DNA sequence: CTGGATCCAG
DNA sequence: CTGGATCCAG
DNA sequence: CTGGATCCAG
DNA sequence: CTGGATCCAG
């Protein structure tokens, strides 16, 4: 990845939010892969299509992209409110890309968050534009991300550093299993991976697996099928292209 | 027209 | 954190 | 939806 | 039997 914009495509432009809106969607376009299954490039998205910048035309995942000089803030300015709240509760809900940018118009951090970290409570509304504004009326809305874990934030490239596409893909899929908060429960999909991560190495078989039983026993205590449970979870991670099967009880990260 | 889009600016 | 001024398109 | 339980190919 | 596939309850 280089990390410069091209600003050549902004001359006859005024406005620094709509320089920023073309250099930034040029970036990514030219720079960015899908986060979730690594194809390049991603597709844009038509102009005025709400909270839709760019599509992976393999996987399908839809990505909002924010972009800002300097540092990220927890609260994160939009567009319209009421079709912010309609695309968060969408069956296609889009990822999350954040993008910093210096003074010198290059790329300074690139992250991506999983869409289940951004619902309808992150959509705060903002009070309509006086009638004085050209916009009279409009409403729009500041994302809070407050909440959102500090896993959540998957980063591409992190102080001036592109990082690993293949580190990003495997941290993305995990992600996509993250919970919203610390205070919603266990969960064993999330509870495997981590033994999963526990495994030295790229193979494993369910022998390695069944050594955890104790564990997980403790964390799903009513549970009385464990066994069954994790042959169950390494099903999810499989489809989910997190592990591969290789026959009768083996196993490979991948 | 109306109603989406940018994030900047202070 | 809050309120706008640019842009874009059906 | 996800946690707990059941089924059966091989 | 063992491990992948499926069902049922809240
Ligand atoms: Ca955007
Ligand atoms: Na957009
Ligand atoms: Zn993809």
Redesign the pocket.
């Known amino acids: 990845m280089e990390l410069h914009f091209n600003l050549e495509l902004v001359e006859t432009?005024?406005?620094?939010?709509?320089?920023?809106?073309?250099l930034?969607e040029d970036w990514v376009y030219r720079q960015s892969y899908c986060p979730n299954c690594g194809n390049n490039p991603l597709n844009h998205f038509?102009?005025?299509?709400?909270?839709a910048?760019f599509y992976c035309n393999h996987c399908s995942e839809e990505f909002?992209?924010?972009?800002?000089?300097?540092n990220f803030?927890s609260?994160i300015?939009?567009?319209?409110y009421?079709?912010?709240m309609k695309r968060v509760q969408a069956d296609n809900n889009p990822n999350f890309f954040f993008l910093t940018y210096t003074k010198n118009f290059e790329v300074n951090n690139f992250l991506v968050l999983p869409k289940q970290f951004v619902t309808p409570k992150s959509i705060?509304q903002?009070?309509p534009?006086?009638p004085?504004?050209?916009?009279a009326g409009?409403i729009?809305c500041?994302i809070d991300l407050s909440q959102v874990p500090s896993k959540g934030r998957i980063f591409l490239v992190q102080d001036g550093q592109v990082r690993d596409p293949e580190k990003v893909t495997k941290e993305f899929k995990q992600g996509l299993f993250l919970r919203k908060s610390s205070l919603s429960?266990?969960?064993?999909?999330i509870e495997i991976l981590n033994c999963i991560d526990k495994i030295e190495g790229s193979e494993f078989t369910?022998?390695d697996m069944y050594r955890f039983e104790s564990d997980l026993k403790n964390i799903?205590?009513?549970?009385?099928?464990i066994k069954?449970?994790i042959?169950?979870q390494?099903?999810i991670l499989?489809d989910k292209e997190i592990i591969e099967?290789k026959?009768?009880?083996?196993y490979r990260k991948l």
């Open positions: 432009y005024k406005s620094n939010s709509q320089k920023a809106r073309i930034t038509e102009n005025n299509r709400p909270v910048d909002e992209l924010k972009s800002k000089k300097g803030s609260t300015n939009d567009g319209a009421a079709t912010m705060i903002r009070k534009l006086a004085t504004a050209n916009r409009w729009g500041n429960s266990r969960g064993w999909t369910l022998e799903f205590v009513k549970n009385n099928h069954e449970k042959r169950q390494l099903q499989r099967f026959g009768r009880g083996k």
